[PDB]
A paper describes a structure:
TRPC4 is one of seven members of the subfamily of TRPC (canonical TRPs) channels. TRPC channels are Ca2+/Na+-permeable cation channels that are expressed in many cell types and tissues, including brain, placenta, adrenal gland, retina endothelia, testis, and kidney. The channels play an important role in vasorelaxation and neurotransmitter release. Several studies showed that TRPC4 and TRPC5 form receptor-operated, Ca2+-permeable, non-selective cation channels.
The resulting sample was homogeneous and suitable for structural studies. We then solved the structure of TRPC4DR in its unliganded (apo), closed state by cryo-EM and single-particle analysis at an average resolution of 3.6 Å. The final model contains residues 18–753 with some loops missing. It sits inside the membrane and forms a cavity with helices S1 and S4 in which we could identify density corresponding to a sterol. Since we added CHS during the purification of TRPC4DR, we fitted this molecule into the density. The selectivity filter is formed by four glycine residues (G577) that constrict the pore to a diameter of 7.0 Å (3.7 Å defined by opposing van der Waals surfaces). The lumen of the pore below the selectivity filter is mainly hydrophobic and leads to the lower gate at the cytoplasmic end formed by the conserved residues I617 and N621. The four isoleucines and four asparagines constrict the pore to a diameter of ~5.3 and ~4.2 Å, respectively (1.6 and 0.7 Å defined by opposing van der Waals surfaces). In our TrpC4DR structure F572 and W573 form part of a prominent hydrophobic contact between the pore helix of one protomer and helix S6 of the adjacent protomer, stabilizing the pore. Interestingly, we found an additional density corresponding to an annular lipid at this interface. Since PA has been assigned to a similar density found in polycytin-2 and PA has been included in our purification buffer we fitted PA into the density.
Numbering used by the authors:
A (entry chain A): 187 to 272, 284 to 319, 324 to 388, 391 to 648, 652 to 660, 696 to 727, 731 to 753
B (entry chain B): 18 to 118, 135 to 172, 187 to 272, 284 to 319, 324 to 388, 391 to 648, 652 to 660, 696 to 727, ...
C (entry chain D): 18 to 93
Write the structure that this text describes.
Amino acid sequence: VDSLRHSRSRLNIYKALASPSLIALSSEDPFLTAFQLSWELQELSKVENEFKAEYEELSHQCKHFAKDLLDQTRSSRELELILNFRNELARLKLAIKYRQKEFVAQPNCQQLLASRWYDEFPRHWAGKLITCVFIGLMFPLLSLCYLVAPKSRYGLFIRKPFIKFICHTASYLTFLFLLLLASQHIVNPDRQGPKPTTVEWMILPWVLGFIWTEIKQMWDGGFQDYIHDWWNLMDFVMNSLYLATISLKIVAYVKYSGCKPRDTWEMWHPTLVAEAVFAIANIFSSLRLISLFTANSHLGPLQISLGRMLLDILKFLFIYCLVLLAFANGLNQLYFYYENSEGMTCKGIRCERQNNAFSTLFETLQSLFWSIFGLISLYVTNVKADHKFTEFVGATMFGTYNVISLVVLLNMLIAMMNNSYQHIADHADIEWKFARTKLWMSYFETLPPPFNIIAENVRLNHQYQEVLRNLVKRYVAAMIRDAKTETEENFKELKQDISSFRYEVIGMM
Amino acid sequence: IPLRIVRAESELSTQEKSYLSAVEKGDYASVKLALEEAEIYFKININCIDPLGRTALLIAIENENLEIIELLLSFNVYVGDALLHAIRKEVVGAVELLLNHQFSDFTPDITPIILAAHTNNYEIIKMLVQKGVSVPQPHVDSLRHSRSRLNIYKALASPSLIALSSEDPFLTAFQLSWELQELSKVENEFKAEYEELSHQCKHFAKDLLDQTRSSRELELILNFRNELARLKLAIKYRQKEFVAQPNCQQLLASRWYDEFPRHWAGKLITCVFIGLMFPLLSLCYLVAPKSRYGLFIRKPFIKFICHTASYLTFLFLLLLASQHIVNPDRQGPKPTTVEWMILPWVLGFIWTEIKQMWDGGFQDYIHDWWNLMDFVMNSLYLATISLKIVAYVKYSGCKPRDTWEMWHPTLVAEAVFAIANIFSSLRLISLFTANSHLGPLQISLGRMLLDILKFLFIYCLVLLAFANGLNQLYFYYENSEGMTCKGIRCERQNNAFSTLFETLQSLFWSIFGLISLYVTNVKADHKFTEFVGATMFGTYNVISLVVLLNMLIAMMNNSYQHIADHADIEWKFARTKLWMSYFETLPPPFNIIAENVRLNHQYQEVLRNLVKRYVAAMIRDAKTETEENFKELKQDISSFRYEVIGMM
Amino acid sequence: IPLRIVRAESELSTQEKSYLSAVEKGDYASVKLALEEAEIYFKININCIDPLGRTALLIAIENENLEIIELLLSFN
Ligand SMILES: CC(C)CCC[C@@H](C)[C@H]1CC[C@H]2[C@@H]3CC=C4C[C@@H](OC(=O)CCC(=O)O)CC[C@]4(C)[C@H]3CC[C@]12C
Ligand SMILES: CC(C)CCC[C@@H](C)[C@H]1CC[C@H]2[C@@H]3CC=C4C[C@@H](OC(=O)CCC(=O)O)CC[C@]4(C)[C@H]3CC[C@]12C
Ligand SMILES: CCCCCC(=O)OC[C@H](COP(=O)(O)O)OC(=O)CCCCC
Ligand SMILES: CCCCCC(=O)OC[C@H](COP(=O)(O)O)OC(=O)CCCCC
């Protein structure tokens, strides 16, 4: 009825319900109420379209409160009772689920996670490097002795999370190494009908391991907050291109045994499309080695900045694309009557001599894409005529595009990326430690082999209620003796010095 | 609609609220009248806490009222950890009484001197050490161990504790800043905390030195255990705020010049006038190392000019070492006049590097980047000498150079000589910590290289990814029939993406606009594979040119925004250690052919004066600021109190 | 575990602390009554400094109280 009073009414009761004092005095588990309430305020930041600063600030204060309760633990036993609460680390898994990144970048949580993660890694760079590569040279030994005996002989190494991280990393980069090896002239000549190499038969029990791994993590995620991860999309396009490569090599393996020379083949021959899809596949498979950068202390926040400024490069690639289509609409309309292709053994704009560039809309788009790299060499604007007015207008509206692209939109791109990175370094290490946390959580269960894939609660609820009572009492103390203080600290001493002297005067009579 | 209940928490009776209201509002009459229920049981414990978690003693400490505290201690109220509550409020009148007599508000691993040092109050620590309170030494619960070590390091790193104890505060500040810098990296996660503590130790070591009011005192500080031994130890411990102190820089500059004094014309002409006469000065130093003329070379600025002039005339007759005025093309060099002039500079660098590597014991030697640059420079020079020796024997054919082999020793010698003198000409960049204008800019150079060296870990795997794509797409297209010229360095761009090496080379050169887009064609009609090759080459050009380069400039931008708070400090530290490199004894640039009890006494006296001055500048400043007007308010209230009560 | 000792520094007696407490808290009665020990030697110099490095005149300047300053200058 009154869309004003409804909105401010909901805003008032959410801001009242999101105070730390009300969550302290009520709401039996303050962690769940802080978590769910930060989630609901994050939802209403987007659903209610306009008070997003207000709802965003309330959700941020809920996150800070959930952190500051955890910050008051003074025993590691207490911290274990907080995080291992409903296998293990169930509250920490729920905290990862609710995007509580200030909660999980708390330092003592990171000590408990690092003590889980290492299990005797300890030094300096030489010893750490040589021990990591010494483990990495022995990953199939460790994996096959885990398979022949999953017991306390040696498989405790693969049960340790750092060592299985090294083993998965070594297996993935040796997959990349024998993809690097998968094109050398040492190893087939050019015939229709592949009959795949030794190297492809070595490739296949890695790709099938990725198929099984993706099917497992997609099945046990129920496609929700699965596809919402970008790396699952990258795995999906990678494995789809791999399955298309396998299927197209199966199609080309039958029906084709002519051994006719490759220069005499057709366009859209299945072998050529298979090799192209294989290249588009292994660019992605070699590229998502970038996602191991949430493990190094030095490379972490920089690739976080990468992944966040892509979200503004993806806005300039909505402005720039319609600038592109505008100048394409201009240029092909100006030059499509100039279709010079008599002779011309070589056509297009990938040619050694720049032929008719702006003839079709496709070559026009292609030309204007390549002109921002200094690769369209300015004699494309001539035509074999004496039409110097149309040639001059073509050069003029090509120079206009070069200006708008090169000295305006590129510099706006660097200005937007500049301040958009100035916005983030207040919450840089928090997001990095959250990312390396969930990467560490991805190695605690149970999937050991990288490519070789062939009452009991009443005590705990009691201890959890006791630890919550102590944490709430400590937090109420750290709120009263700090925020009430600061300046009111000297003002209360003034009030004392006035009132005590008042009772000294009146009581004297 | 949530009908909720308050969480379980202990609640106060109303008969103790009438007591606590008089405690907070501050009576002495009615509080003592409530405290007349010691023998007569008024069914209450007087120390039972309120819903705020306070005993009444904690209020009386919280309201600074000494007489209620005296009353409650006179009637034996339970303190628990009231001492720590008094120390945390830094009320002196409470602590001076409490020293003279389940729940905690503190971690139980806190002794009463630790939080006293955390609060950084002088007289509280001063009366605690009169009681003789010892702090532990920092050699199951990985939480309590870490916070325990952090508390005792933060307590040990307070300026007041280093003032009142620890006989030489300079050494304790230095070693403690070193240990906190180590634990910044070893303890992986409290690096802001340990880093801030080490920074405050550095500021304290500076502010002790800042209080010297006599140059004699400053000399007694720096020349203490040849000379400048404490300054050398300060350079050793990376105390860059300590050495960018101004008066230390005046003493260093008075050492450095020794009558340089003007304006740019006179300074320029006198510097180049000295620089035109460096072999005269060096050989008259060698024939007579006495007070004739060699006092010039003993002066540090003049020997800096002489080493600079010798190094740039080495570079000048390397510039001269390729002109057509001076050999034709034969196997067997028999080196030039110019190479025979080069050799007694290179051997001087060999002797200089061996000396400074021998007397550094390879530790904090190789940790300097310029020693690595000297090492690769002299290694390439020795390889050049050895390869010219190898080519000088066994080769006298005088066959034309176009008919030579690849990997011939003369050609590899000349290539290694070029890779050598690019470095030898390049480390003239390291004389830029002597000019006032060029200094901080090359400091910014040397620090933003540490993020360019992170983009050259991202960019290299982007490179290897697109190389894996492109050579896999094009290795069946090996067109080399005919082709007198091959590769991608050719005049016509031949088969670019054939091997992985030429692929990497192509994708490196494509970011400079030098790969001219007809490399993606092959002599076929395979327009799909040609289009996918152009598409995944354009993807690389986009990711390289408009994404990673702009991320590189954004990271370098804010990474330089982080540094200009400590720019001149690091520059003066760098030019300091460059000046320290010219005070001993290595004069020739290329022409290389009890007594402590008095000093310890004076040093203890100067330290006593400096500590006393610093305690004064801490008390009269940091205690002041606003508490400065508040203390005047306290005076105006208490003086009028004694005017009223004393009137009766 | 470091068993350390305070650095050498001059220490105040307890008989001048009762004087200085009245100086900081700001009496005129008891400060003058302590300053009645000019002719009668109470074995103390009234200008002897505390561990804070202050004579009582410096406190009376520090607490803006003109009459204690006038008293101490009147008693030299
Ligand atoms: C040939 C070069 C130019 C490109 C090939 C890339 C690889 C050499 C790089 C890419 C990613 C790098 C990885 C990035 C991150 C880490 C994490 C690192 O783990 C840590 O540093 C954790 C230390 C800690 O516990 O704090 C181990 C090395 C590793 C796997 C690196 C190993 C080397 C890798 C595979
Ligand atoms: C031909 C040009 C374009 C390139 C050749 C480079 C040289 C001309 C430059 C490179 C480094 C320069 C040196 C950089 C730093 C200094 C420090 C400068 O000393 C001071 O200014 C100190 C003044 C002070 O005491 O504050 C004396 C000139 C000098 C040696 C410069 C002399 C001229 C040098 C050798
Ligand atoms: C956002 C503003 C866009 C400006 C577009 C533009 O300047 O076009 C340049 C035009 C295009 O160059 P040509 O067509 O080759 O002459 O240059 C000139 O005509 C004369 C030189 C004049 C050079 C300025
Ligand atoms: C980070 C995003 C990477 C985008 C990669 C990319 O845009 O490739 C451009 C491709 C590559 O250019 P060509 O292969 O020469 O056509 O251009 C086109 O196919 C049509 C013009 C379309 C121009 C946009």
